Amino acid sequence: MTISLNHTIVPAHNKEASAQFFAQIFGLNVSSVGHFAAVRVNDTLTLDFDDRETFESHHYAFHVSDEEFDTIFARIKQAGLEYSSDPMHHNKGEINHRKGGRGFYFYDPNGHNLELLTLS
């Protein structure tokens, strides 16, 4: 039938801090699974945070509902985090309106580029 992404490993300097950051902002939960701090995103995907000393910035873009967009964006502002309309973060403190939707980018504690969008 269908190929689906089930797991991906997210490298982190501190896997618990990174998993907690992600779970707090997205309204999800952290589980200790083997050597990972695992965050189940939905009924098909889990992000496995893994302790790593050296790695480059990843880029993850998430489709969310309008309600989820508003809820997550409020948590980012409440947490005192910077965000941008553009992937390079040249345009801070604003969102994009690409494809008749809403979008923005924000870095995780490792410098991974997280992207939220309402229309895919």
Residues that bind a copy of itself (CB under 8 A): 1-9, 11, 26, 28, 41-45, 48, 52, 54-56, 58-65, 67-68, 115, 117, 119-120
Q: Identify the DSSP state of 98.
A: G
- Which residue, 56 or 80, is less far from a copy of itself as judged by CB? 56
Q: Does 9 bind Mg ion (CB under 5 A)?
A: no
Tell me which amino acid residue 86 is: D
Which does residue 63 touch among Mg ion, a copy of itself, Ca ion, none (CB within 5 to 8 A, set by kind)? Answer: a copy of itself
CB of 42 to Ca ion, least distance (A): 5
| Structural tokens at position 73 | 């964006």
Q: 68 and 42 in contact (C-beta within 8 Å)?
A: no
d(C-alpha 41, C-alpha 44), whole Å:
8
Q: Are 109 and 58 in contact (CB under 8 A)?
A: no
15: CB partners within 8 A, 6+ apart? 36, 37, 49, 50, 51
Find the binder of Mg ion among 9, 17, 28, 45 (CB under 5 A). Answer: 45
Verify binding: residue 5, Mg ion, rule CB under 5 A.
Answer: yes
Binding site for Ca ion (CB under 5 A): 4-5, 45
Binding site for Mg ion (CB under 5 A): 4-5, 44-45
